Amino acid sequence: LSLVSILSSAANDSSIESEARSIASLIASEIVSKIRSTKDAKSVQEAFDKIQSIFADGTPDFLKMTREILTVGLIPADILSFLNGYLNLDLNSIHNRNPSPKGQAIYPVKAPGDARYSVAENALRAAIHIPASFGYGKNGKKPVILVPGTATPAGTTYYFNFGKLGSAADADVVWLNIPQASLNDVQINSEYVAYAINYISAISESNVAVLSWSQGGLDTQWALKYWPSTRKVVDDFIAISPDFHGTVMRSLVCPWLAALACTPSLWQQGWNTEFIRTLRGGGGDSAYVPTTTIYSTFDEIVQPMSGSQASAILSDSRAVGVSNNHLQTICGGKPAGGVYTHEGVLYNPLAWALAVDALSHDGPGDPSRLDLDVVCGRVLPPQLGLDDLLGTEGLLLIALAEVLAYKPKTFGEPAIASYAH
Ligand SMILES: [Ca+2]
């Protein structure tokens, strides 16, 4: 199967809403037609000019952003070809062959007080992609777990951004390919994060760091809350565009898809859901470990992502250290404080500088320790280029394919797990 086949099937799928079928058809036909060109971005500034053209009538929603990404010709053929074969890509595998962990048992229960796992150990461990270059904390490199966002596999997501964190920090990346691309129940998705934390810490005999994107923040926060043993081994939680309070919708429709029939994780990411309320209760709205949140006003998925009520904000009632980093505040009226989408924060220079600063100091990332004139003056971190910007934007095409192919669709959020009340 391919991105083209999934979207062509969705275009001919009677269960899907008229507008989404048209977008799927347009995208499937635009990919096969495009498979460099005159319309392609010749530079990084040209890529941003195309993004700013999409934002000309205001911040779009998920469906408008995804449709316009191809209309403006932001994704070149070579990147489209790579994104098209994401399902068969080894980096996105949920069937990785990892050895049994040594030392104290981490399954079924690492420590009293941890929530029971509903997922089998073999399935949890197989979701972890450990690169052959991983040093198991024997080389002075801190293991960093890359947690994916909604409808997008980790492997492809981080290939174009933080998969390269080791080039900027003393970080040894691993990524978690959550089955069904994080579209199932967030409570189930979180188990993969909780297990990955305790597993990577065990094999490395070291504390770890977690870097998450989008829903990845919710998966990590839930794992930290309900598996307290994970809190002791996580030194830094770097959250890119996190929706710790979910997101609002103008109409009575789900986040992302904006329909009546969606997926469990789409429905759970609503502002006033039982999921969000359950997570935020008992201090779940405060950090569990040093947390560095990084978010943008121009987030087309999550709102509000500015002001005092921003979804990304965590309080610090436990006194573990928290920094809530709003791009348009820290880099106000500067290139790094520009039009950075929900996915765009993954290639933001301030996001990278904060991630590096967080990993090199006790506590979270601190903008006061950075040379903000240099950092805010950039459009991309020195570690990333044009293809990284374009590829990260191209993820929306995979996110749409995964959302549309998800079956059976649901009209509401699932029941709250017994351990959470
Ligand atoms: Ca730190």
Side-chain angles (χ1 to χ4, degrees), residues 387-410:
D387 291 359
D388 297 306
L389 195 169
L390 310 176
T392 300
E393 282 308 325
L395 297 173
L396 292 172
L397 306 169
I398 292 167
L400 184 64
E402 285 292 326
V403 168
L404 301 187
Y406 189 95
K407 292 171 189 199
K409 278 185 182 70
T410 65

PDB file of all heavy atoms in Angstrom, residues 387-410:
ATOM      1  N   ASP A 387      15.129  20.795   2.460  1.00  0.00           N
ATOM      2  CA  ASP A 387      14.459  19.485   2.381  1.00  0.00           C
ATOM      3  C   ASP A 387      13.827  19.057   3.699  1.00  0.00           C
ATOM      4  O   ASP A 387      12.791  18.390   3.697  1.00  0.00           O
ATOM      5  CB  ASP A 387      15.417  18.403   1.853  1.00  0.00           C
ATOM      6  CG  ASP A 387      15.805  18.550   0.383  1.00  0.00           C
ATOM      7  OD1 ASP A 387      15.310  19.494  -0.276  1.00  0.00           O
ATOM      8  OD2 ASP A 387      16.601  17.718  -0.105  1.00  0.00           O
ATOM      9  N   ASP A 388      14.440  19.468   4.820  1.00  0.00           N
ATOM     10  CA  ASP A 388      13.947  19.211   6.176  1.00  0.00           C
ATOM     11  C   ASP A 388      12.668  20.016   6.433  1.00  0.00           C
ATOM     12  O   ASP A 388      11.702  19.454   6.940  1.00  0.00           O
ATOM     13  CB  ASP A 388      15.035  19.530   7.206  1.00  0.00           C
ATOM     14  CG  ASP A 388      16.265  18.652   7.066  1.00  0.00           C
ATOM     15  OD1 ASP A 388      16.114  17.414   7.083  1.00  0.00           O
ATOM     16  OD2 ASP A 388      17.378  19.205   6.957  1.00  0.00           O
ATOM     17  N   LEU A 389      12.643  21.308   6.020  1.00  0.00           N
ATOM     18  CA  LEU A 389      11.480  22.195   6.114  1.00  0.00           C
ATOM     19  C   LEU A 389      10.339  21.596   5.262  1.00  0.00           C
ATOM     20  O   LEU A 389       9.228  21.420   5.766  1.00  0.00           O
ATOM     21  CB  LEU A 389      11.851  23.609   5.586  1.00  0.00           C
ATOM     22  CG  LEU A 389      10.919  24.809   5.901  1.00  0.00           C
ATOM     23  CD1 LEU A 389      11.591  26.095   5.541  1.00  0.00           C
ATOM     24  CD2 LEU A 389       9.603  24.752   5.131  1.00  0.00           C
ATOM     25  N   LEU A 390      10.628  21.282   3.980  1.00  0.00           N
ATOM     26  CA  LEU A 390       9.646  20.731   3.034  1.00  0.00           C
ATOM     27  C   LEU A 390       9.096  19.378   3.457  1.00  0.00           C
ATOM     28  O   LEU A 390       7.885  19.175   3.415  1.00  0.00           O
ATOM     29  CB  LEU A 390      10.194  20.678   1.596  1.00  0.00           C
ATOM     30  CG  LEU A 390      10.829  21.965   1.031  1.00  0.00           C
ATOM     31  CD1 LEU A 390      11.413  21.727  -0.355  1.00  0.00           C
ATOM     32  CD2 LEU A 390       9.845  23.128   1.014  1.00  0.00           C
ATOM     33  N   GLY A 391       9.985  18.482   3.877  1.00  0.00           N
ATOM     34  CA  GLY A 391       9.634  17.145   4.336  1.00  0.00           C
ATOM     35  C   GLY A 391       8.750  17.152   5.566  1.00  0.00           C
ATOM     36  O   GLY A 391       7.793  16.376   5.636  1.00  0.00           O
ATOM     37  N   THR A 392       9.053  18.040   6.538  1.00  0.00           N
ATOM     38  CA  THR A 392       8.257  18.213   7.768  1.00  0.00           C
ATOM     39  C   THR A 392       6.836  18.677   7.411  1.00  0.00           C
ATOM     40  O   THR A 392       5.870  18.202   7.992  1.00  0.00           O
ATOM     41  CB  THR A 392       8.968  19.159   8.743  1.00  0.00           C
ATOM     42  OG1 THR A 392      10.245  18.611   9.074  1.00  0.00           O
ATOM     43  CG2 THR A 392       8.169  19.415  10.023  1.00  0.00           C
ATOM     44  N   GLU A 393       6.715  19.591   6.447  1.00  0.00           N
ATOM     45  CA  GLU A 393       5.425  20.088   5.970  1.00  0.00           C
ATOM     46  C   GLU A 393       4.635  18.986   5.254  1.00  0.00           C
ATOM     47  O   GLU A 393       3.421  18.884   5.440  1.00  0.00           O
ATOM     48  CB  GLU A 393       5.617  21.324   5.059  1.00  0.00           C
ATOM     49  CG  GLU A 393       5.884  22.607   5.839  1.00  0.00           C
ATOM     50  CD  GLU A 393       4.881  22.931   6.933  1.00  0.00           C
ATOM     51  OE1 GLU A 393       3.684  22.625   6.748  1.00  0.00           O
ATOM     52  OE2 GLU A 393       5.286  23.493   7.975  1.00  0.00           O
ATOM     53  N   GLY A 394       5.349  18.145   4.498  1.00  0.00           N
ATOM     54  CA  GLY A 394       4.789  17.012   3.769  1.00  0.00           C
ATOM     55  C   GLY A 394       4.139  15.949   4.640  1.00  0.00           C
ATOM     56  O   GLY A 394       3.375  15.132   4.127  1.00  0.00           O
ATOM     57  N   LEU A 395       4.421  15.957   5.968  1.00  0.00           N
ATOM     58  CA  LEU A 395       3.856  15.028   6.958  1.00  0.00           C
ATOM     59  C   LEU A 395       2.333  15.099   7.046  1.00  0.00           C
ATOM     60  O   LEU A 395       1.694  14.108   7.410  1.00  0.00           O
ATOM     61  CB  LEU A 395       4.437  15.286   8.357  1.00  0.00           C
ATOM     62  CG  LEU A 395       5.931  15.090   8.553  1.00  0.00           C
ATOM     63  CD1 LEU A 395       6.341  15.549   9.953  1.00  0.00           C
ATOM     64  CD2 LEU A 395       6.352  13.649   8.266  1.00  0.00           C
ATOM     65  N   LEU A 396       1.759  16.277   6.741  1.00  0.00           N
ATOM     66  CA  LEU A 396       0.319  16.516   6.752  1.00  0.00           C
ATOM     67  C   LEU A 396      -0.396  15.612   5.767  1.00  0.00           C
ATOM     68  O   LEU A 396      -1.544  15.240   6.007  1.00  0.00           O
ATOM     69  CB  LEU A 396       0.008  17.986   6.437  1.00  0.00           C
ATOM     70  CG  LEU A 396       0.437  19.006   7.493  1.00  0.00           C
ATOM     71  CD1 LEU A 396       0.261  20.396   6.974  1.00  0.00           C
ATOM     72  CD2 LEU A 396      -0.324  18.828   8.798  1.00  0.00           C
ATOM     73  N   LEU A 397       0.298  15.237   4.673  1.00  0.00           N
ATOM     74  CA  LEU A 397      -0.233  14.345   3.641  1.00  0.00           C
ATOM     75  C   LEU A 397      -0.377  12.928   4.188  1.00  0.00           C
ATOM     76  O   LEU A 397      -1.367  12.257   3.906  1.00  0.00           O
ATOM     77  CB  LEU A 397       0.650  14.373   2.386  1.00  0.00           C
ATOM     78  CG  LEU A 397       0.931  15.758   1.775  1.00  0.00           C
ATOM     79  CD1 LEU A 397       2.011  15.665   0.710  1.00  0.00           C
ATOM     80  CD2 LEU A 397      -0.341  16.387   1.181  1.00  0.00           C
ATOM     81  N   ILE A 398       0.583  12.493   5.012  1.00  0.00           N
ATOM     82  CA  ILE A 398       0.533  11.186   5.670  1.00  0.00           C
ATOM     83  C   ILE A 398      -0.569  11.218   6.742  1.00  0.00           C
ATOM     84  O   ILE A 398      -1.395  10.298   6.804  1.00  0.00           O
ATOM     85  CB  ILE A 398       1.917  10.783   6.249  1.00  0.00           C
ATOM     86  CG1 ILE A 398       2.918  10.508   5.113  1.00  0.00           C
ATOM     87  CG2 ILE A 398       1.787   9.570   7.181  1.00  0.00           C
ATOM     88  CD1 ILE A 398       4.368  10.417   5.566  1.00  0.00           C
ATOM     89  N   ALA A 399      -0.598  12.304   7.548  1.00  0.00           N
ATOM     90  CA  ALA A 399      -1.601  12.485   8.599  1.00  0.00           C
ATOM     91  C   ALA A 399      -3.025  12.377   8.033  1.00  0.00           C
ATOM     92  O   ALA A 399      -3.851  11.677   8.623  1.00  0.00           O
ATOM     93  CB  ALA A 399      -1.393  13.807   9.328  1.00  0.00           C
ATOM     94  N   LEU A 400      -3.278  12.975   6.843  1.00  0.00           N
ATOM     95  CA  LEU A 400      -4.585  12.903   6.196  1.00  0.00           C
ATOM     96  C   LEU A 400      -4.920  11.477   5.766  1.00  0.00           C
ATOM     97  O   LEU A 400      -6.021  11.008   6.055  1.00  0.00           O
ATOM     98  CB  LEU A 400      -4.715  13.869   5.002  1.00  0.00           C
ATOM     99  CG  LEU A 400      -6.111  13.905   4.348  1.00  0.00           C
ATOM    100  CD1 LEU A 400      -7.172  14.426   5.315  1.00  0.00           C
ATOM    101  CD2 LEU A 400      -6.098  14.695   3.069  1.00  0.00           C
ATOM    102  N   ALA A 401      -3.965  10.792   5.101  1.00  0.00           N
ATOM    103  CA  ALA A 401      -4.119   9.410   4.656  1.00  0.00           C
ATOM    104  C   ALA A 401      -4.441   8.491   5.838  1.00  0.00           C
ATOM    105  O   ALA A 401      -5.393   7.723   5.751  1.00  0.00           O
ATOM    106  CB  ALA A 401      -2.851   8.945   3.958  1.00  0.00           C
ATOM    107  N   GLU A 402      -3.690   8.609   6.960  1.00  0.00           N
ATOM    108  CA  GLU A 402      -3.919   7.804   8.165  1.00  0.00           C
ATOM    109  C   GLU A 402      -5.309   8.061   8.781  1.00  0.00           C
ATOM    110  O   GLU A 402      -5.999   7.104   9.145  1.00  0.00           O
ATOM    111  CB  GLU A 402      -2.808   8.031   9.206  1.00  0.00           C
ATOM    112  CG  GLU A 402      -1.487   7.344   8.878  1.00  0.00           C
ATOM    113  CD  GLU A 402      -1.485   5.828   8.939  1.00  0.00           C
ATOM    114  OE1 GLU A 402      -2.207   5.259   9.787  1.00  0.00           O
ATOM    115  OE2 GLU A 402      -0.764   5.206   8.131  1.00  0.00           O
ATOM    116  N   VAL A 403      -5.720   9.338   8.885  1.00  0.00           N
ATOM    117  CA  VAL A 403      -7.035   9.709   9.440  1.00  0.00           C
ATOM    118  C   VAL A 403      -8.165   9.108   8.588  1.00  0.00           C
ATOM    119  O   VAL A 403      -9.065   8.450   9.127  1.00  0.00           O
ATOM    120  CB  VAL A 403      -7.194  11.251   9.645  1.00  0.00           C
ATOM    121  CG1 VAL A 403      -8.641  11.628   9.944  1.00  0.00           C
ATOM    122  CG2 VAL A 403      -6.296  11.747  10.770  1.00  0.00           C
ATOM    123  N   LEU A 404      -8.075   9.287   7.258  1.00  0.00           N
ATOM    124  CA  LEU A 404      -9.092   8.804   6.327  1.00  0.00           C
ATOM    125  C   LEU A 404      -9.182   7.285   6.264  1.00  0.00           C
ATOM    126  O   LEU A 404     -10.291   6.758   6.204  1.00  0.00           O
ATOM    127  CB  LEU A 404      -8.919   9.427   4.931  1.00  0.00           C
ATOM    128  CG  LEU A 404      -8.993  10.977   4.850  1.00  0.00           C
ATOM    129  CD1 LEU A 404      -8.984  11.451   3.406  1.00  0.00           C
ATOM    130  CD2 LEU A 404     -10.223  11.535   5.558  1.00  0.00           C
ATOM    131  N   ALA A 405      -8.044   6.578   6.354  1.00  0.00           N
ATOM    132  CA  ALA A 405      -8.021   5.108   6.322  1.00  0.00           C
ATOM    133  C   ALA A 405      -8.403   4.467   7.662  1.00  0.00           C
ATOM    134  O   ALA A 405      -8.675   3.268   7.693  1.00  0.00           O
ATOM    135  CB  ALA A 405      -6.648   4.613   5.889  1.00  0.00           C
ATOM    136  N   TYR A 406      -8.407   5.242   8.766  1.00  0.00           N
ATOM    137  CA  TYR A 406      -8.732   4.701  10.088  1.00  0.00           C
ATOM    138  C   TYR A 406     -10.156   4.188  10.142  1.00  0.00           C
ATOM    139  O   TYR A 406     -11.098   4.928   9.858  1.00  0.00           O
ATOM    140  CB  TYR A 406      -8.478   5.722  11.207  1.00  0.00           C
ATOM    141  CG  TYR A 406      -8.606   5.127  12.594  1.00  0.00           C
ATOM    142  CD1 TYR A 406      -7.488   4.667  13.284  1.00  0.00           C
ATOM    143  CD2 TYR A 406      -9.847   5.028  13.222  1.00  0.00           C
ATOM    144  CE1 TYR A 406      -7.597   4.137  14.568  1.00  0.00           C
ATOM    145  CE2 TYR A 406      -9.970   4.478  14.498  1.00  0.00           C
ATOM    146  CZ  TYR A 406      -8.841   4.043  15.169  1.00  0.00           C
ATOM    147  OH  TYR A 406      -8.961   3.514  16.433  1.00  0.00           O
ATOM    148  N   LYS A 407     -10.299   2.908  10.493  1.00  0.00           N
ATOM    149  CA  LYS A 407     -11.581   2.215  10.599  1.00  0.00           C
ATOM    150  C   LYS A 407     -11.537   1.241  11.784  1.00  0.00           C
ATOM    151  O   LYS A 407     -10.506   0.605  11.989  1.00  0.00           O
ATOM    152  CB  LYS A 407     -11.919   1.464   9.292  1.00  0.00           C
ATOM    153  CG  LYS A 407     -12.217   2.385   8.116  1.00  0.00           C
ATOM    154  CD  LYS A 407     -12.343   1.659   6.784  1.00  0.00           C
ATOM    155  CE  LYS A 407     -12.421   2.662   5.654  1.00  0.00           C
ATOM    156  NZ  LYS A 407     -12.985   2.069   4.411  1.00  0.00           N
ATOM    157  N   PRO A 408     -12.621   1.102  12.582  1.00  0.00           N
ATOM    158  CA  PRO A 408     -13.904   1.815  12.476  1.00  0.00           C
ATOM    159  C   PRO A 408     -13.831   3.226  13.052  1.00  0.00           C
ATOM    160  O   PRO A 408     -13.112   3.459  14.021  1.00  0.00           O
ATOM    161  CB  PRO A 408     -14.874   0.893  13.224  1.00  0.00           C
ATOM    162  CG  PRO A 408     -14.028   0.204  14.263  1.00  0.00           C
ATOM    163  CD  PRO A 408     -12.609   0.165  13.727  1.00  0.00           C
ATOM    164  N   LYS A 409     -14.533   4.180  12.421  1.00  0.00           N
ATOM    165  CA  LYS A 409     -14.557   5.555  12.906  1.00  0.00           C
ATOM    166  C   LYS A 409     -15.512   5.680  14.085  1.00  0.00           C
ATOM    167  O   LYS A 409     -16.364   4.811  14.276  1.00  0.00           O
ATOM    168  CB  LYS A 409     -14.832   6.564  11.779  1.00  0.00           C
ATOM    169  CG  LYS A 409     -13.562   6.875  11.000  1.00  0.00           C
ATOM    170  CD  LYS A 409     -13.731   7.953   9.956  1.00  0.00           C
ATOM    171  CE  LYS A 409     -12.444   8.158   9.188  1.00  0.00           C
ATOM    172  NZ  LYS A 409     -12.134   7.009   8.291  1.00  0.00           N
ATOM    173  N   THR A 410     -15.295   6.684  14.942  1.00  0.00           N
ATOM    174  CA  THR A 410     -16.075   6.864  16.169  1.00  0.00           C
ATOM    175  C   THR A 410     -16.685   8.253  16.245  1.00  0.00           C
ATOM    176  O   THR A 410     -16.082   9.211  15.775  1.00  0.00           O
ATOM    177  CB  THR A 410     -15.198   6.601  17.416  1.00  0.00           C
ATOM    178  OG1 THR A 410     -14.182   7.598  17.483  1.00  0.00           O
ATOM    179  CG2 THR A 410     -14.548   5.219  17.416  1.00  0.00           C
TER     180      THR A 410
END
